[PDB]
Amino acid sequence: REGTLFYDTETGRYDIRFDLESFYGGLHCGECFDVKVKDVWVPVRIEMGDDWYLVGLNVSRLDGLRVRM
Amino acid sequence: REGTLFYDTETGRYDIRFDLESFYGGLHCGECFDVKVKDVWVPVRIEMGDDWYLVGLNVSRLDGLRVRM
């Protein structure tokens, strides 16, 4: 359910860490999930343009966001 | 303050994201904090070897760890 979003170097994709040793495996274009914003969960979709970005929420960067699926 | 640990490509350092747009500003060698493992906070100290690593916790990778200062 809940995890942290991060960029994986040896795979130009963002991924989600759910546990100390439990990862999603890599997010693909179009995948949806919620981003934690203060006390609310905002629905977003990750996409690829010139670089990875989120549709549904304006953020400075995707690194370190708390997410939920 | 609780946050998420992530690799900051703008500085080559690991940093902590506390809120949607609040960041620690880049961790330096010797700085300490706790890492969430299960439902316990483990004290660590970040250092630089061949690459960044944590003294106090043997983990495959630092990306996405939940932490607190």
CATH class of this structure's domain B1-68: mainly beta
**Experimental technique of record:** X-ray
Residue with tokens 């690799």: B7
In this complex, the residue of A7, A8, A66 whose CB is nearest that of residue B4 is A66
Q: How far is CA B42 from CA A10, A27, B18, B36, in A?
A: 28, 29, 18, 6
* Rounded CA separation B31/B37 (Å): 19
Residue with tokens 């996405």: B64
Cβ pair B4:A8 closer than 8 A: no
Can you give chain A as a three-state secondary structure string? CEEEEEEECCCCEEEEEEECCEECCCCCCCCEEEEEECCEEEEEEEEECCCEEEECCCCCCCCCCEEEC
| First-to-final CA distance of chain A | 5
Please answer yes or no on whether B4 and A4 come within 8 Å at the CB atom: yes
Domain locations along chain A: 1-68
Radius of gyration (C-alpha) of chain B in whole angstroms: 11
| B37 to A20: CB separation less than 8 angstroms, yes or no | yes
Residues of A in contact with B7 (CB under 8 A): 6-7, 9, 63
Q: Which residues of A touch B16 (CB under 8 A)?
A: 64
Query: Rounded to whole angstroms, how far apart are CA atoms B5 and A63?
Result: 9
Tokens 């630092």 map to which residue? B62
Interatomic CA distance for residues A24 and A11, integer angstroms: 13
